[model samples]
Target chain A: MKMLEQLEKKLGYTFKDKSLLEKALTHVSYSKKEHYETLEFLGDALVNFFIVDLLVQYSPNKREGFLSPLKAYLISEEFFNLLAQKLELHKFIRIKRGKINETIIGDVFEALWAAVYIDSGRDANFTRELFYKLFKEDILSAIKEGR
Target chain B: MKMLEQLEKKLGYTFKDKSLLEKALTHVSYSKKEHYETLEFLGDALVNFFIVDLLVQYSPNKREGFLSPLKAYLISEEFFNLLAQKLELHKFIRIKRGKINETIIGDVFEALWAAVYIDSGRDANFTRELFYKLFKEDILSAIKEGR
Candidate 1:
């Protein structure tokens, strides 16, 4: 299909349950069935846990104090808010009102992240690939400096 | 399945040792070999984390204010006391000397949750599924409102 399946096309990660794709895309204001909150929970824990896993692999010597903030930066709402713009997540998210803001945008991004994780059986390699793309510069420099 | 076997069968868990389950089930009034405190500690962390994971999915729109209170209510001692009765934990518990109290009822539940977590390779899925089953009403209510 030469159509608009571009979110996964753009990200190179396809979901097993495409419905989760749509579910996570919808804001709570939109509908209740198969809603995004739980999946968002799934994703938040998944991302934070695996980001620490990545930091452990990349910065073997860094303590939790150092790794914690680095993770905080990547998983933070502010970061997700910025990321919402990068993903052009507005294009995918189904907001009910006239327009949505950064806070809503961030939730969409997070819920989508969890959708990808669940689709992949919570795969770590997928996470490594995803975050490396998201924060390659920050991760690389920190890994190099042993921070 | 006798008394010891009855314990696991009743809860649908398999303990590596009768003594391990006995230890968790044993009251300080009765035995001292393996107190439930350490397991209780482990279970406390395990259950709390599992609950957050549950809430993230079930309570998408609710802020931290809503989330903290809900989580606290479910994992609270009073909460567990009621659940312990539902699970018939009182029957399995072997106190050496005296009739147990509500506090004991709560502790047994906490330790057993940790036991299940430990038994399942420290996986949260088991507890997540367990809690979802236990608190289906609460989860349904939260999700119904997209809370």
Candidate 2:
């Protein structure tokens, strides 16, 4: 019925554990227990793994030194902010009524990423593909300019 | 001979005000009066500036989305560790014997960069050129392969 519900449908996997999804959406201000810190950490690593794999596959001749910087650019705060806005995730975040700001939006976006991973049973391959699809244009542009 | 003498010789610049050079080399653990924390802060900004400039110049068509990651990698712990080892800076450091480790070495290297800038009277242009010289190979390699 809501945009989150639509997102769930589009993602093609309903949370067997709906609490996990809700927890992912919970802001730190709401409740630490409901927050997705651990999930975010896990998701952060997952995102890295996927990004690295993609780069390696795409640029077979590239060295670790080169891949390292490209990876940093993809996961940085500014890029994250852009991705968050694209996903329209700000609407779903549960923050103090007046406390909404850029910092909180950024954190919640990261938490949501963690949520996606957990919802997928930490399936690295699936998450990796998801990231590739979501970030394909950004990644391609960055690669073209040797970023 | 003062420890700073050897480093200055290697770096090829004499401090107009010896205090600036001394301050850059001072570790937070060594002594508060001579600590290079402030200098390190300035150096950090300077380093960021050069990185941005290099990326912009090298990748004329690139956007911040692409440049930021390369910047992070260049400034990360791994690169700093490599820089410290290359510069042979550890031997001259005056840390508490117990605090010596990879982490401390990395921090001290950044502090030294900061010190150099302040001692140079905030000559960002000089520092920028120095960074380019030191990091030229690495930066070029990163761009070539998309690292």
Candidate 3:
């Protein structure tokens, strides 16, 4: 509870079901019961969809040719890993063995958002609002620079 | 207006902003002002996200390893193109010079859903409800056989 509360503080959102948070942070290596991969799969879709929506809001007139690659970078392993590092997200992962690799960190980053999305009753707007609050500057700068 | 009404009858969802529907069906070759590609980009994300949610609902216990390839097929060009053909969507596309290829058909299928999503004030559930109405049999059958 104490450890997960620390992650919640960093995440800026509280989990109604701590197990969802634990599952989000749990590596396959850590648990036989459940892990973050499935949630990561779901989260990957959320990130891509929400980012496209965000891009449209930020650049209403830009064509898909202009926005697609920008969306790519925003969802890329390199970029997610950078964001994960800033949050020290890997530190919260429940990995019993194996290195806490960049890929795992990025996956966990996405899984964390999935956890937040589910914890909030699958409210797309609330999840999106939380995301905007957490990474508004980073996302804005990325879109600006990518253009 | 008459032709759009025909398409609406087939779509089972009428558009408040007929222009959005027109935009969704307009090919780049048809309009210098705008095209479906941007909406297609947005719709691709919606399809992916909503389909994942659907899969989790249908098969709550299925792991990603079991579900990912199934998701891939459901979103594949072949599948969307088949669905688009069933809707006879290409018959309604506003195109000029280019051949109405399978790819465009698939892309326009996605853009059409995007148009529906936006036309309904970005209500994910409403859009999803329309999707379920359109493809419940196809989606359920696919998941059943994909396993």
Candidate 4:
């Protein structure tokens, strides 16, 4: 319960459906019975959709040629890792013992992003807006930091 | 010829074998007739390898959890578009006229990244270094500008 609160506080959003958050935090190894794979798929799309929308808005004058690489960079695994770390997502994830920490943790983070979108009722627009708002500062900071 | 020369100048490294460079530029529509698809595969690996090396060096504390997303974002279609534009690659591309501009152009740009690595003789270290030096500043600049 304490950990859940911390995750909510850290992420700045609370799940109305705690199950969604729990699923997001759950690992495949913890139970194939209730894995976050479906959530991960949905979340992957959500992330891509939101990022694409943000980039489109951000680069109004950018031609498709210019936009492609920018989008790739924003969604890259390295950037996702940074976002996950910033949110301290690793702490909230529940994994089975003995699975490699890094791999499982990253997958969970992806699942969490998906879960958040679904918990928002699968509203693409809402999810996109929320995602952009949540990560805008951090993303901006990363760009400024030039990593 | 002049355009290719300009691109080479901008990229700051000469193709030891110009045909490799030309081959990289070929579209998949030209596949089975000497297209850039094979080179694209190599380029994909080249990009992954280079990014891994970079993240490993830059963020020694970062685990794969942090690294994987960053890698995905870096190689996404959006970033490839930016690269294509930076090189003014579209102007030189020989595409079958009337194909939907959006998807075809993007694929060619990706193929180009592959071509570049292959042209460099699959030297992971050298190609990765070259990619970093070439695009790092632009990427950082985008991030900073967003802020």
Best by TM-score: 3
Look at candidate 1 and tell me the lDDT of residue A80.
Answer: 67
Per-prediction TM-score, please? 0.50, 0.47, 0.90, 0.48
Local accuracy of candidate 4 as per-residue lDDT tens digits, A55-102: 544454434466566667776777787778877776777668676466
What lDDT tens digits, residue by residue, belong to model 2 across residues A47-125?
5444444554465335445665765776677767777766676777676566878766766666566577656764434
The count of residue-pair clashes in candidate 3 stands at: 0
Deviation in Å, model 4, residue A109 alpha carbon: 2.5
In order, the Cα lDDT scores of the candidates are: 0.64, 0.61, 0.82, 0.61
Which pairs in model 3 have colliding backbones? Answer: none
Question: Where does candidate 2 stray beyond 4 Å?
Answer: A1-147, B1-4
Model 2: what TM-score?
0.47
lDDT value, residue B20 of candidate 3: 89
Across B55-144, the per-residue lDDT of candidate 4 in tens digits comes to: 433543333455456545555667667766777777666655445365555666655655665566544346556787877765544333
Better of 3 and 4 by DockQ: 3
Give the TM-score comparing model 3 with the true structure, all chains together. 0.90
Give stretches of model 3 more than 4 Å off. none
**CAPRI tier for the interface of model 4:** incorrect
RMSD of each: 8.0, 18.3, 2.4, 17.0
lDDT of 2 at B93: 73
CA error at residue B128 for candidate 1, angstroms: 3.2
Worst 10 residues of 3 chain B by lDDT: B1-10
Pairs in steric clash, model 2: A66-B147, A67-B147, A73-B69, B24-B115, B39-B114
Q: Give, for candidate 2 chain B, the lowest lDDT window spanning 10 residues.
A: B37-46
